């Protein structure tokens, strides 16, 4: 078209239509010039990290990318409250993305002073990977997301990837992708860019908390017709052995026969937020549950979904068990406990085992006249036939989706940090400033990004007589309205908000 | 319609049509008044339960519920013998339920005597939870299911459920459900209520015993082309380390390569029915295997499907691993060994590991010059890629179906007490007497219940030359006919009848 006319408009709003939701977010971005237009090898040696668990080999690229993978990008807190309150489930259907109002700047620096002016003959490259031929970095929950507060202008993150490695060295199998080898649509100040996406079928992310515990599904008024072994001896003495069978009934509910059993567990170490209770020695890295791969230990985080604490004790949290979000302005290193937000899994304690507790016992030998019966605790229990479990809940700050690795097999692919597992997630959107002349002009660009997702919902069918637990703000007065700006205009979120409030039967 | 005419007829018979079976059952029932028409909160303290593991909370309701969930309701022994001998598998296709001849009786009480008079005005309210809003208690294998013998008249059991609880007390998440709120149909004496339900698709129950063990599938006449490690030393002495490989062949059949491994196991303690062999100590609760949930140990019963005992030893049973039924007239608490019937799973020992035996061994360390190769026993094992297993068998007395707890994930939902797992089982059928005025006329009802299920079958295609194992009665003289009445007309079931007789290849 022309420079003097707009290439797009500002859409930020959410339409609630029937059982579906349409959420739109338009933001303003600024893309710098990364690596002075160079692809550069990066390994631990360049950074200097000695430890062998941290050995990595990869490449850093001039390209940037857009990460909208976090919920609060697409949902205002009121929309999030209106969602988690009335809905038993939700899931994305369609995705629409528009990139427009390209404004390219050029920086001309004098001795002490820099001068800024537009450049009309300068172009901006953009392309999206539809074939997933490139690495997928959007699933690691990196920073650099679209900001939660629409008036905040954000900086596009830098794109880089990793590959196979031995120490800092590579192997002949290591792959190097040059992103210039992908056909990319080039934009000047008047052009715009858009594409449409379709989410593949994924199950409704459950957004409710079970009311009935697993073991209690029985009927307190009626006996079972199964029997259990009550007494192996008549009384204290010698040669007193006997077998006595009783009925499993509501008087003793622990011994009844059951149809199903709680989900798997991989135990985590228990850390108390009251510091005197914790052990004196340094157990942060030595005592943490870690899965080892190819000789490189890796901490288990967040780990399989498990209840974080027994009922009545909320002071204890699994060491690597739950997601931890930082409060506004929280420092990067060695911040105290009150500066970070520790999420807790208490909703799933119905159908899931406690992350800091054993899964149970197993008999370790043949009890006989010579030797007594013995039992050993179970630390990690794999899947057994007939288990049921709840996946990890998602938060207003948490990731939305994650890419399922391309593999011969996987079980219940739903990602461990929460969200929707997919073998074809929304593509990566790569963007960079086209170099204009190893002598180039110092340059950058800004623009608009509007991402629109169509959410589907599941209505609340419950006949429950007493009122539900709903997410509500506190009426008590404060110096700042929760989920709003302070006197200096810094948007801050008071606490991580979960998705599980409403109740269902088991 | 009218009092002078009946609202239905008496249907009991089983039509064998092609590959399908239509099983019809009709009974006479009696419905009393429960809780004097009140909803009474009940917890362990109100009953007086001290144990922390037995802490429960819930409500007792006036409504009753029909339970046909057990097999012997729909089948006669001869219809069972005709089913299990000629067929490799059966599943329920359709369910028809008809309630007729509702009669209401009012009891008038005087000091001298009590007289019961029919009450025309009173009505019975019956409704079925089609949307599954209410808690499901049919799956717990509770007492109160329809009687084995048609002549016997049974009393409908009271319906109650247990919600969330912390110790004796209830919690905010718990939801109280009122039966009255759901829409229901009221029937007078002339009136009858009937409904038809279609079963969800489910896998055919396997009713055959593999004739081939998982490990012996090999051809006995031929050597494999794969090799194994035969010798790690030449002889006795110093510095004898060497490697020797040999062909895996019929001479040694343990070391051959195999494409499949047996199913999972969670070990149970082994108890002998001969009392002098068992240890002289109280290990009934201490030695049992239990899965801990939310801090409440719940015994593991029956647990994952596993062979009950090694071949050749039938006098050993898993402590909590076998469905146990009582003989006719068995007392409620602390009966001797002979009053009860203990099912044994030895039919599945081909593809499944023995419940009382370790699953196998795994090496615990690297060998070296200074360290011997060490092993340890695997007490429980989760699912691995490539396992196969048989589920637990269904019995004439056992439950049929169970509801799959609604959850984000589950694995092999087939219930652990046996039968067909279903997300949408046959709905609960609730019934009560309508209160007639907190001073109400003493009232109870009676009538007829007719339930009809259509079972689909899988024919026996096998080429086996030698005659099958079959289920037959013994011809030796006895004082009674098994599965018939004694001199006083009491129906007795002498032993549990498994479904697995016919054989298949593995």
């Amino acid at each position, epitope marked *: 078209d022309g420079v003097g006319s707009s290439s797009g408009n500002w859409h930020c709003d959410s339409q609630w239509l029937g059982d579906r939701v349409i959420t739109t977010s338009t933001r303003t971005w600024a893309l710098p010039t990364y690596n002075n237009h160079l692809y550069k090898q990066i390994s631990n040696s360049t950074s200097g990290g000695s430890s062998n668990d941290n050995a990595y080999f990869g490449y850093s690229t001039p390209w940037g990318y857009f990460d909208f993978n976090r919920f609060h990008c697409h949902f205002s807190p009121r929309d999030w409250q209106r969602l988690i309150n009335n809905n038993w489930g939700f899931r994305p259907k369609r995705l629409n993305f528009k990139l427009f109002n390209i404004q390219v700047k050029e920086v001309t620096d004098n001795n002490g002073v820099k001068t800024i002016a537009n450049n009309l003959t300068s172009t901006v490259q953009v392309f999206t990977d539809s074939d997933y031929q490139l690495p997928y970095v959007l699933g690691s929950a990196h920073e650099g997301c679209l900001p939660p507060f629409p008036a905040d202008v954000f900086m596009i993150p830098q794109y880089g990837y990793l590959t196979l490695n031995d120490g800092s060295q590579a192997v002949g199998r290591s792959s190097f992708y040059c992103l210039e080898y992908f056909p990319s649509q080039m934009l000047r100040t008047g052009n715009n860019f858009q594409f449409s996406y379709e989410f593949e079928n994924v199950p409704f992310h459950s957004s409710y908390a079970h009311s009935q515990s697993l073991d209690r599904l029985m009927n307190p008024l009626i006996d079972q017709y199964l029997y259990y072994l009550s007494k192996t001896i008549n009384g204290s003495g010698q040669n007193q052995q006997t077998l006595k069978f009783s009925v499993a009934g509501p008087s003793n509910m622990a011994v009844q026969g059951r149809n199903y059993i709680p989900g798997p567990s991989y135990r985590q170490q228990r850390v108390s937020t009251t510091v005197t209770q914790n*052990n004196n*020695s*340094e157990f942060a890295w*030595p005592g943490a549950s870690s899965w080892a791969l190819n000789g490189r230990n890796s901490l288990m985080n967040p780990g399989p979904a498990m209840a974080s604490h027994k009922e009545g004790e909320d002071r204890f949290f699994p060491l690597s068990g739950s997601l931890i979000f930082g409060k506004q302005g929280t420092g990067r290193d060695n911040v105290d406990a009150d500066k970070v937000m520790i999420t807790n899994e208490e909703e799933i304690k119905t159908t899931n085992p406690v992350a800091t507790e054993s899964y149970g016992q*197993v008999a*370790t030998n043949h009890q006989s006249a*010579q030797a*007594q019966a*013995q*039992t*050993g*605790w*179970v*630390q*990690n*229990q794999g899947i057994l036939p007939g288990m049921v479990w709840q996946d990890r809940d998602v938060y207003l700050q948490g990731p939305i989706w994650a890419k399922i690795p391309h593999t011969d097999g996987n079980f219940h692919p739903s990602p461990l940090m929460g969200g929707f597992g997919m073998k074809h997630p929304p593509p990566q959107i790569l963007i960079k400033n086209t170099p204009v002349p190893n002598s180039f002009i110092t340059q950058y660009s800004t623009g608009q990004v509007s991402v629109e997702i169509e959410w589907e919902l599941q209505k609340e069918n419950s006949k429950r007589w007493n009122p539900e637990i709903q997410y509500t703000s506190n009426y008590y007065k404060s110096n700042n309205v929760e989920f709003a700006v302070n006197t200096e205009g810094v948007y801050s979120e008071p606490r991580p908000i979960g998705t599980r409030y409403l109740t269902r039967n088991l | 319609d009218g009092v002078g005419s009946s609202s239905g007829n008496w249907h009991c018979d089983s039509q064998w049509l092609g590959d399908r079976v239509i099983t019809t059952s009709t009974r006479t029932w009696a419905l009393p008044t429960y809780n004097n028409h009140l909803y009474k909160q009940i917890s362990n303290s109100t009953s007086g339960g001290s144990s922390n593991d037995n802490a429960y909370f819930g409500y007792s309701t006036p409504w009753g519920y029909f339970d046909f969930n057990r097999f012997h309701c729909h089948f006669s022994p001869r219809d069972w013998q005709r089913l299990i001998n000629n067929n490799w598998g059966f599943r329920p296709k359709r369910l028809n339920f008809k309630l007729f001849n509702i009669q209401v009786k009012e009891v008038t009480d005087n000091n001298g005597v009590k007289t019961i008079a029919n009450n025309l005005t009173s009505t019975v309210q019956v409704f079925t939870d089609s949307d599954y809003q209410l808690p499901y208690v049919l799956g717990s294998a509770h007492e109160g299911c329809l009687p084995p013998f048609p002549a016997d008249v049974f009393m409908i059991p009271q319906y109650g459920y247990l919600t969330l609880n912390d110790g004796s007390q209830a919690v905010g998440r718990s939801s109280f459900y009122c039966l009255e709120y759901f829409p229901s149909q009221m029937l007078r004496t002339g009136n009858n209520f009937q409904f038809s339900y279609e079963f969800e698709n489910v896998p055919f129950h396997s009713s055959y015993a593999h004739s081939q063990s998982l490990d012996r599938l090999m051809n006995p006449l031929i050597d494999q082309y794969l090799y194994y490690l035969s010798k790690t030393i030449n002889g006795s002495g110093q510095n004898q380390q060497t490697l020797k490989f040999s062909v895996a062949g019929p001479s040694n059949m343990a070391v051959q390569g195999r494409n499949y491994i047996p199913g999972p196991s969670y*070990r149970q303690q082994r108890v002998s029915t001969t009392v002098t062999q068992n240890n002289n100590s109280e290990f009934a609760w201490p030695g049992a295997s239990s899965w801990a949930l939310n801090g409440r140990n719940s015994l593991m019963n029956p647990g994952p499907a596993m062979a009950s005992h090694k071949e050749g030893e039938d006098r050993f049973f898993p402590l909590s691993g076998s469905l146990i039924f009582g003989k006719q007239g068995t007392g409620r608490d602390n009966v001797d060994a002979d009053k009860v019937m203990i099912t044994n799973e030895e039919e599945i020992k081909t593809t499944n590991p023995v419940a009382t035996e370790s699953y196998g061994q*795994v090496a*615990t*360390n690297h060998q*070296s010059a*200074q*360290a*011997q190769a060490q092993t*340890g*026993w*695997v*007490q*429980n*094992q989760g699912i691995l890629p490539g396992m196969v297993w048989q589920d637990r068998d269904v019995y004439l007395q056992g439950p049929i179906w169970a509801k799959i707890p609604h959850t984000d994930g589950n694995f092999h939902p087939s219930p652990l007490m046996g039968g067909f797992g279903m997300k949408h089982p046959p709905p609960q059928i609730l019934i009560k007497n309508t209160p007639v005025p907190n001073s109400f006329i003493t009232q109870y009802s009676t009538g007829q219940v007719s339930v009809e299920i259509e079972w689909e079958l899988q024919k026996e295609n096998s080429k086996r030359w030698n005659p099958e194992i079959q289920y037959t009665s013994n011809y030796y003289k006895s004082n009674n006919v098994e599965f018939a009445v004694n001199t006083e007309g009491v129906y007795s079931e002498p032993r549990p009848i498994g479904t697995r007789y016919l054989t298949r290849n593995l």
Partner: antibody
Framework: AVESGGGLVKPGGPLRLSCAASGFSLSDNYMTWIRQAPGKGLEWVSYISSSGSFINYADSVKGRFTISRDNAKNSLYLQMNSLRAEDTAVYYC?????????????????????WGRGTLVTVS | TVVTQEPSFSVSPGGTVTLTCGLTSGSVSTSYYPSWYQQTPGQTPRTLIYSTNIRSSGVPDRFSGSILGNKAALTITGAQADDECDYYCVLYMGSGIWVFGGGTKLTVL
């Protein structure tokens, strides 16, 4: 076939005696030093983790002795410093097996499984 | 934190005597893992039993060790000439610290 032996030091001075390792690796095993005065009692002296990140001492010898475990040489070094006449006694190189059961079915027990023959160290 | 057991326990052959070692500061149980070590004079001490009831591979079944009452103790049944030598008691507590008892011998008559 596991067993070991201790290092021999002269009486009358602070040294570091060694515990050699035969039949097993000191890497994956929890190791402890036990010292007994002749004719009276056995007293715990020091403990070292298999990862070695956890080390703890007896109050009498705490803040004094220092333990070090060399995996490559299969030797367990305990350095005693600034000895006292009350440190005169026999030392054992105990091997402790903690929770011998496998992870799926684990039992936690703590006891001294293997005992190196005692060597006397006198302060004089 | 001082282990307590009685120094004097003499039993004639063919007689089973119980040795009881407890903790003065607090009551014992499985959590405070008990153990029993015989020290045969002229030789290094060998673990008689460990973690209450469990019996070491080498040890005989004549003597059984169990936690009876507040403080766990070994219970030798029908003692014989061989089993007699200096005994010591020890229960694990805290992290990496064990406390030993005063020691006891026993003698055939």
């Amino acid at each position: 076939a596991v067993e070991s032996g201790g290092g021999l030091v002269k009486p009358g001075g602070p040294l570091r005696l060694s515990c050699a390792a035969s039949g097993f690796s000191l890497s994956d095993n929890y190791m402890t030093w036990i010292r007994q005065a002749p004719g009276k009692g056995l007293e715990w002296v020091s403990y070292i983790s298999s990862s070695g990140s956890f080390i703890n001492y007896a109050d009498s010898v705490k803040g004094r002795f220092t333990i070090s475990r060399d995996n490559a040489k299969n030797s367990l070094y305990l350095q005693m410093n600034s000895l006292r006449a009350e440190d005169t006694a026999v030392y054992y190189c105990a091997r402790v097996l903690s929770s011998g059961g496998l992870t799926t079915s684990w039992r936690a027990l703590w006891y001294f499984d293997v005992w190196g023959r005692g060597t006397l160290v006198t302060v004089s | 934190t001082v282990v307590t057991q009685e120094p004097s326990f003499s039993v004639s052959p063919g007689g089973t005597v119980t040795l009881t070692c407890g903790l003065t500061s607090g009551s014992v149980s499985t959590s405070y893992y008990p153990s029993w070590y015989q020290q045969t004079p002229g030789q290094t001490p060998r673990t008689l039993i460990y973690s209450t009831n469990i019996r070491s591979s080498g040890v005989p079944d004549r003597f059984s060790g169990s936690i009876l009452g507040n403080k766990a103790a070994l219970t030798i049944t029908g003692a014989q000439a061989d089993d007699e030598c200096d005994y010591y008691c020890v229960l694990y507590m805290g992290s990496g610290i064990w406390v030993f008892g005063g020691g006891t011998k026993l003698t055939v008559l």
